[PDB]
């Protein structure tokens, strides 16, 4: 059981600072160096620091004015802080475990956006299964997750009882700006009407968790 | 400062066929210790990277002997031979030779596959949505292969422009297969009771069907 | 032995590069980690772990115990000849090294751990502990007169579970060797009080925190105490090794320590590894019930994480910092150097420092202040009648990304101008 879990902010104004706390399980910080990683949406990953065992820290020559790398050994956390935060900085951040000068472990990443908006909670609106919506004995019922700013959504159907069939679309920045997304399940035409299908939505963020029953 | 070129933007490579990428370094990446630090991650859809290769061709824990890390100086390839489903991604090369540490633009590997046709579905909004006073009719399309798709939203018989965003999902693992929803989003207003909202899909491997919803 | 005692600006210390000396060969291109450089008489010990990679992982090449003499390299400069070099077969089965020297033979003590680090994976360490003597001039010979290892016929722990070297340097008196060590107390069984801990001037400090940071976490199964491992040559065929814990008069988490003679008088130094930041060294008032005077020193720290930095004196949960020991070299007024990084919360810019309780009187950089450094090892003793103090300094190589440790030679200046 080794993890590393990133805590972030979600969202960062600009020239404000991002502060992201990493949690590390099964390992002491002692024995491994810790390194950060950042991908920005879109474009490829990009390396911006390294926390030795002995807590020499070595940092890309570009974020040294705004970058620092800190951890508690005691607490098993490594924390990173930047300063200056520009929508360019926007991405997804990751806190590494390297082995080697090479990145054994990597942790879930942490969705940070840089922005001047608020943050904002989601509706979910249900994609009822019909007759339209029906081909052959596969039938299709979905949620429609709306008006959300910060990125990060994890939807379930059944609290993850069902997994089966189950696609989540990228989520598209509206003219609104706030992201919408549409999560759809493959069902049997013969279970719907008997069988409840529930949606659970999670926007870490506003920290919302919705359960919306879907029905034809 | 080292700067990590990777050839291929995009590889499209059928199964059982063999995959070639290939990352140039712009400076020699031999260390003083004599060990060239390159390393390939994969970054599977939906994933943090992981690690395949270090030290040019030294294959990680766990990773398959069909993956093969080659290369001399600055010239480095991976190969996958036998190229299975579960291999599509993103690749990029890493060099940990020299502070600081630099990764390649990436390469997409894609899957060929034979023709597959898409399964389509329409969704009216819901009465809930419709109290918010928004409009959203979505349109499924699951299960093709050729990403390549063109969807026509019709409202009443009038082909509609500017109300319309697409959405596709990464390929599947298990299908090699891409699924897209097209949102149409009006207002309660704007949808003045037109009947006839449709939905055309064209995609290689049909003849072009239409599925709509009467308003009422 | 006469040194200026008097604050001043002018860059009066001039050291020198005497690195040449130690089996560093910067071109191998490797990292050179776990130092240790011990001074007794005119003879030293020496001892690193090479390896082909990263520092904290990367494949170990080599780990060298050498020893030998301190002498006059011909221009009135000390430098260190290495006369006996040991490589310990299984290199990665040695930790924490100590060396004291007695009677022309270096003694260093080390753990053998089969499960890593003791400190790390303590409670599966076996506890073994290896003796290795050598000699600091050897002589061709047939057997094991140059280096030969010691029967520890026992252990006597006390109450602890296990009990380990931990640090540098020790000393001798008579017949009995003195290393530095720590014992591992069950923290169930580690009797403490809260109110006894010192968060009156700490808004945020909490009582349980001087306890809770005596482990290297909160929940750890053992307490670290620091302490000294006493070694009697003249005692039986096969001496036994006797732990002895150290006073709880400033207690901190068990941490790298060093004991050594300066002036006439073991003098005790405690690295600073968790929330008592302030520099932890005195005159050993007693060694078997030892019991250290510390230096209420008001101006010597080190550098710490966020939760412990330098300056810091309120309790807290923390586990961090860098061993950066210091020499006494005048009792009469005590003032001593060492080599301490100038920064509050970054591994950097050593300075070497000479310094009373309440004043550093004069300081030169070895290094820039961007520069990245940890452990610091210093030792003076006389040259001709000049106080010479040579100070190991672990300094980061940037085209390498590798550390590796430098050699100063710094003459205590008899004259303020
Ligand atoms: C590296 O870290 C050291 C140590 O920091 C301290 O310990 C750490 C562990 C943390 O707990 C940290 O919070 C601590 O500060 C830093 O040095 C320290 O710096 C502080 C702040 O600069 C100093 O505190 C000052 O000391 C001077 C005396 O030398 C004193 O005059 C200051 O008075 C201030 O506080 C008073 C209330 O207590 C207040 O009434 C004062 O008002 C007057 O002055 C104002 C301007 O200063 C003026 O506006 C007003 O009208 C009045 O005229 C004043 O605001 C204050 O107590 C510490 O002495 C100092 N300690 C040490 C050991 O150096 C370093 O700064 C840091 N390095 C870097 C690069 O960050
Ligand atoms: C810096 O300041 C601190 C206070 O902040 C100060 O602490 C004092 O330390 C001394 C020495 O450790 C303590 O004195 C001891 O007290 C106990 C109990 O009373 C005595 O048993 C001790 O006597 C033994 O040791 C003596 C010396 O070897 C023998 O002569 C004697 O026969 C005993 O064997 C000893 O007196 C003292 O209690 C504390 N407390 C105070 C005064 O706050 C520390 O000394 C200061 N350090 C320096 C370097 O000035
Ligand atoms: C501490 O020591 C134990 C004992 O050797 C280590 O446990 C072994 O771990 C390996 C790999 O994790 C297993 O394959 C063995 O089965 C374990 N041995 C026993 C006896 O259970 C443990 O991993 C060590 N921990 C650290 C932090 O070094
Ligand atoms: C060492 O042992 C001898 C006798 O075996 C004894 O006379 C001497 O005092 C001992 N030294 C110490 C420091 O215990």
Same mark, same amino acid.
């Given at each position: ?216 | ?44 859809? &939906? ?21 093969? $890390? ?35 633009? $990436? ?25 918010? &006073? ?27 422009? $500017? ?18 929803s097209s949102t149409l989003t009006l207002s309660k207003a704007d949808y003045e009771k037109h009947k006839l909202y449709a939905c055309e899909v064209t995609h290689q491997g049909l003849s072009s069907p239409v599925t709509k919803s009467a308003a009422a | 032995n006469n040194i200026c005692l008097q604050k001043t600006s002018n860059q009066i210390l001039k050291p020198k590069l005497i690195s040449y000396t130690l089996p560093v060969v910067g071109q191998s291109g490797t990292c050179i980690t776990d130092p240790l450089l ?5 003879? =030293? ?83 073994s502990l290896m003796m290795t003597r050598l000699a600091v001039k050897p002589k061709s010979n047939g057997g094991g007169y140059n280096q030969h290892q010691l029967a520890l016929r026992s252990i006597e722990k006390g109450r602890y579970d296990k009990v380990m070297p931990y640090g540098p340097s020790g000393i001798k008196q008579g017949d009995t060797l003195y290393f530095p060590a720590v014992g591992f107390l069950v923290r169930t069984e580690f009797k403490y009080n809260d109110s006894n801990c010192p968060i009156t ?95 209420? /020193? ?59 309780? /309440? ?48 050699? =100063? ?9």
């Amino acid at each position: 059981q080794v993890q590393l879990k990133e805590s972030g902010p979600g969202l960062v104004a600009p020239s404000q600072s991002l502060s992201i706390t990493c949690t590390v399980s099964g390992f002491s910080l002692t024995s491994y160096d810790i390194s950060w990683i950042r991908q920005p949406p879109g474009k490829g990953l990009e390396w911006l620091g390294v926390i030795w065992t002995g807590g020499v820290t070595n940092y890309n020559s570009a974020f040294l004015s705004r970058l620092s790398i800190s951890k508690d050994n005691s607490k098993s956390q490594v924390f990173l802080k930047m300063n200056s935060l520009q929508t360019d900085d926007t991405a997804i951040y990751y806190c590494v475990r390297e082995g080697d000068w090479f990145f054994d472990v990597w942790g879930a990443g942490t969705t940070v956006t840089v922005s001047s908006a608020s943050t904002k909670g989601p509706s979910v609106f249900p994609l009822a299964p019909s007759s339209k919506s029906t081909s052959g004995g596969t039938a299709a019922l979905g949620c429609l997750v709306k008006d959300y700013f910060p990125e990060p959504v994890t939807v379930s159907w059944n609290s993850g009882a069902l997994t089966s069939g189950v696609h989540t679309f990228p989520a598209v920045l509206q003219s609104s700006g706030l992201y919408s997304l549409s999560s759809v399940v493959t069902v049997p035409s013969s279970s719907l009407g008997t069988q409840t299908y529930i949606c659970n939505v999670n926007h870490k963020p506003s920290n919302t968790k919705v359960d919306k029953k879907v029905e034809p | 400062d080292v700067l990590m070129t990777q050839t291929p933007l995009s590889l499209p490579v059928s199964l059982g066929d063999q995959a070639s990428i290939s990352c140039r370094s712009s400076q020699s990446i031999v260390h003083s210790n004599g060990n060239t630090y390159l390393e390939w991650y994969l970054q599977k859809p &939906g994933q943090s990277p992981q690690l395949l290769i270090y030290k040019v061709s030294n294959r990680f824990s766990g990773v398959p002997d069909r993956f093969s $890390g080659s290369g001399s100086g600055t010239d480095f390839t991976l190969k996958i031979n036998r190229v299975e489903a579960e291999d599509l991604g993103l690749y990029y090369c890493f060099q940990a030779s020299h502070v600081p540490y630099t990764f390649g633009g $990436g390469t997409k590997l894609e899957i060929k596959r034979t023709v597959a046709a898409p399964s389509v579905f329409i969704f009216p909004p819901s009465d809930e949505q419709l109290k918010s &006073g928004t409009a959203s009719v979505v349109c499924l399309l699951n299960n093709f292969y050729p990403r390549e798709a063109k969807v026509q939203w019709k409202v009443d018989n009038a082909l509609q422009s $500017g109300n319309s965003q697409e959405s596709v999902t990464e390929q599947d693992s298990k299908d090699s297969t891409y699924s897209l929803s097209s949102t149409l989003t009006l207002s309660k207003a704007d949808y003045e009771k037109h009947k006839l909202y449709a939905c055309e899909v064209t995609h290689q491997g049909l003849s072009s069907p239409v599925t709509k919803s009467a308003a009422a | 032995n006469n040194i200026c005692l008097q604050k001043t600006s002018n860059q009066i210390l001039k050291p020198k590069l005497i690195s040449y000396t130690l089996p560093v060969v910067g071109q191998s291109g490797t990292c050179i980690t776990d130092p240790l450089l011990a001074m007794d008489e005119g003879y =030293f010990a020496y001892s690193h772990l090479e390896r082909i990679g990263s520092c904290s992982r990367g494949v170990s090449k080599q780990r060298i115990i050498g020893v030998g003499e301190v002498l006059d390299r011909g221009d009135e400069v000390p430098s260190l000849f290495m006369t006996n070099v040991w490589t310990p077969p299984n290199p990665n089965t040695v930790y924490h090294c100590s060396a004291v020297y007695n009677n022309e033979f270096y003694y260093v003590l080390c753990a053998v751990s089969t499960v890593g680090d003791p400190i790390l994976n303590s409670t599966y360490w076996s506890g073994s502990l290896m003796m290795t003597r050598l000699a600091v001039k050897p002589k061709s010979n047939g057997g094991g007169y140059n280096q030969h290892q010691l029967a520890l016929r026992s252990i006597e722990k006390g109450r602890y579970d296990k009990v380990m070297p931990y640090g540098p340097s020790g000393i001798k008196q008579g017949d009995t060797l003195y290393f530095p060590a720590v014992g591992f107390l069950v923290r169930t069984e580690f009797k403490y009080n809260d109110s006894n801990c010192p968060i009156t001037k700490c808004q945020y400090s909490k009582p349980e925190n001087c306890r809770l940071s005596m482990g290297i976490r909160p929940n750890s199964h053992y307490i670290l105490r620091s302490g000294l491992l006493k070694y009697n040559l003249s005692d039986g065929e096969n001496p036994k090794v006797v732990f002895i814990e150290i006073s709880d008069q400033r207690l901190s988490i068990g941490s790298p320590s060093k004991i050594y003679d300066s002036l006439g008088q073991p003098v005790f130094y405690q690295a600073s590894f968790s929330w008592d930041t302030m520099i932890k060294f005195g005159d050993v008032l007693t060694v078997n019930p030892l019991v250290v005077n510390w230096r209420n /020193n008001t101006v010597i720290s080190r550098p710490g994480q966020s939760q412990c930095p330098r300056f810091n004196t309120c309790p807290e949960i923390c586990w961090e910092g860098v061993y950066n020991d210091a020499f006494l070299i005048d009792r009469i007024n005590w003032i001593s150097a060492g080599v301490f990084l100038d920064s509050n919360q970054t591994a950097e810019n050593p300075v070497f420092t000479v310094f009373k309780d /309440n004043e550093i009187l004069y300081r030169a950089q070895l290094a820039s202040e961007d520069t990245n450094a940890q452990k610091t090892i210093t030792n003076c003793f006389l040259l001709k009648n000049k106080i010479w103090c040579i100070s190991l300094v672990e300094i980061y190589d940037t085209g390498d990304n590798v550390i590796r440790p430098k050699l =100063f030679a710094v003459k205590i200046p008899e004259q303020c101008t």
